[PDB]
């Protein structure tokens, strides 16, 4: 994985902006934990069908990965603030990383991916991208599937998802790009 951050990227901020975007549903430029809790348990994992303590597992994790990019309950924010977030959040995982301490990303995939149970499979992801709504193309989520290195079933693992995560959310490397096909730049 490519450790080094590569914030002042264009195309790093693109990335962000465009999830950015996709967060702010009413266009008003700001978003808060509460909307993305709430699409977190409420929208998500509501349509997952996941069990209580599923839900619960994982709002826990969205809470704990969000406010790592500075979000809080009743707390609006803006893009510059956010994407400032994010770049403190991956400085930290890439320390969690380098002393082998569980990441943010990864214990929230763990999360995920115990709603479609440490695999998923194709159908599974293309089924989160529609309802999670980052990736409605089922294009892009066959792209995701031929893009990483999968297991001997074809299916996806939680420890390349989140090296892959590492490399498109933190650090912009180019061996990730594509992770979400077209659905994100
Ligand atoms: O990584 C992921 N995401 C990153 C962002 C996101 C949001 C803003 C940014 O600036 C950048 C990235 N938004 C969402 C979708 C979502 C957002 C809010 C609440 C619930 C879900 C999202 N879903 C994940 C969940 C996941 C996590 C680990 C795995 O191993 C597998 C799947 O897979 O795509
Ligand atoms: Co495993
Ligand atoms: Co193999
Ligand atoms: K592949």
């Keep these: 994985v490519k450790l080094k951050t590569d914030f002042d990227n264009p195309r790093w901020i693109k990335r962000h902006k465009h ?3 996709f967060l702010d549903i009413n266009g008003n430029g700001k978003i808060t934990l509460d909307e993305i809790v709430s699409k977190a348990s409420d929208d998500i994992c509501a349509k997952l069908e996941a069990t209580p303590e599923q839900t619960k597992r994982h709002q826990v994790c ?3 990965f969000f406010r790592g990019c500075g979000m809080e309950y009743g707390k609006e924010i803006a893009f510059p603030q956010f994407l400032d977030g994010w770049k403190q959040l991956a400085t930290s995982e890439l320390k969690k ?3 082998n301490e569980p990441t943010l990303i990864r214990e ?5 991916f115990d709603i479609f149970d440490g695999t998923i499979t194709l159908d599974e992801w293309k089924a989160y991208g529609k309802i999670s709504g980052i990736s409605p193309s089922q294009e892009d989520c066959e792209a995701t599937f031929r893009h990483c290195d999968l297991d001997n079933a074809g299916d996806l693992d939680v420890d390349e998802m989140t090296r ?21 730049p």
């Design 62 to 64: 969205v809470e704990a």
């Design 108 to 112: 929230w995939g763990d999360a995920v």
């Design 97 to 99: 990383w380098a002393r």
């Design 164 to 184: 892959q995560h590492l490399g498109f959310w933190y650090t912009l490397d180019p061996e990730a790009d594509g992770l979400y096909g077209n659905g994100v």
């Design 19 to 21: 999830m950015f975007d």
